């Protein structure tokens, strides 16, 4: 690890979690 | 027919006017000239400014850690912005919640760069460019969904 590309990738997935957490609520409400 | 580049820049201009008022950063002024027909005061911008701020507050500890870590390790901030984006929206399928999270993370990035008398200009410049050109990857999937304005107005 401890690579400049591993640290960028690790940040991208942290944000994807935040996003997915939010997106869990939209589908079930629409239909 | 506003694009992501425009609504994002407007949000940062809107967010800069709300925090301490003061002069708008020359980089942001120039980006509004090099374009931005959407006023920072426009209703759609006011709606999104509230929403994205709530996202930042709810994920405050994560948005600071990830950003503080991002800025202190990158050597090409304009390129690493597109790297993060492609991981979220190209290596995976777009989501409405993933788009809001990205937009909120970029608005939080500017907040830490807008009104600081110690942040170098070349740092602010590459960061503003990294966001706006990397956020173009959402225009496609979002016009399919009806556009930013329609997404929030319900």
Numbering used by the authors:
A (entry chain G): 76 to 106
B (entry chain A): 2 to 35, 37 to 156
What did the published study say regarding this structure?
Epstein–Barr virus (EBV), a member of the Gammaherpesviridae, encodes the Bcl-2 homolog BHRF1, a potent inhibitor of Bcl-2-mediated apoptosis. EBV BHRF1 is a Bcl-2 homolog that potently inhibits host intrinsic apoptosis via direct inactivation of cellular proapoptotic Bcl-2 proteins Bak and Bim and selectively interacts with a subset of proapoptotic proteins (Bid, Puma, and Bax) to regulate apoptosis. Despite sharing very weak sequence identity with its cellular counterparts Bcl-2 (21.7%), Bcl-xL (17.9%), Bcl-w (18.4%), Mcl-1 (9.6%), Bfl-1/A1 (17.8%), and Bcl-B (21.5%), BHRF1 adopts the conserved alpha helical Bcl-2 fold comprising eight α-helices, with helices α2–α5 forming the canonical hydrophobic ligand-binding groove which provides the interaction site for the BH3-motif peptide. BHRF1 engages BH3 peptides using the canonical ligand-binding groove of its Bcl-2 fold and maintains a salt bridge between an Arg residue with a conserved Asp residue in the BH3 motif mimicking the canonical ionic interaction seen in host Bcl-2:BH3 motif complexes.
Bid BH3 is bound to BHRF1 via the canonical hydrophobic ligand-binding groove. The four canonical BH3 motif-defining residues from Bid, I86, L90, V93, and M97, engage four hydrophobic pockets of the canonical BHRF1 ligand-binding groove with an additional hydrophobic pocket occupied by a fifth hydrophobic residue, I83. Furthermore, these hydrophobic interactions are supplemented with two ionic interactions (salt bridges) between D95Bid and R100BHRF1, the hallmark of the pro-survival Bcl-2 interaction between a conserved arginine in the BH1 motif and aspartate of the BH3 motif, which is found in almost all pro-survival Bcl-2–BH3 complexes and R88Bid and E89BHRF1, as well as two hydrogen bonding interactions between D98Bid and G99BHRF1, and between R84Bid and E89BHRF1. In contrast to Bcl-xL–Bid BH3 and the previously determined structures of BHRF1–Bim and Bak BH3 motif complexes, Bid BH3 engages a fifth hydrophobic pocket of BHRF1. Residue I83Bid occupies a pocket formed by BHRF1 residues F72, T76, and V79, all residues highly conserved or conservatively substituted in BHRF1 variants. The use of a fifth hydrophobic pocket has previously been observed in several other viral Bcl-2–Bid BH3 complexes such as KsBcl-2 and the poxvirus variola virus F1L. A comparison of the BHRF1–Bid BH3 complex with KSHV KsBcl-2–Bid BH3 or VARV F1L–Bid BH3 shows that their mode of BH3 interaction is nearly identical, despite having significantly different affinities (110 nM, 20 nM, and 3220 nM toward Bid BH3, respectively).
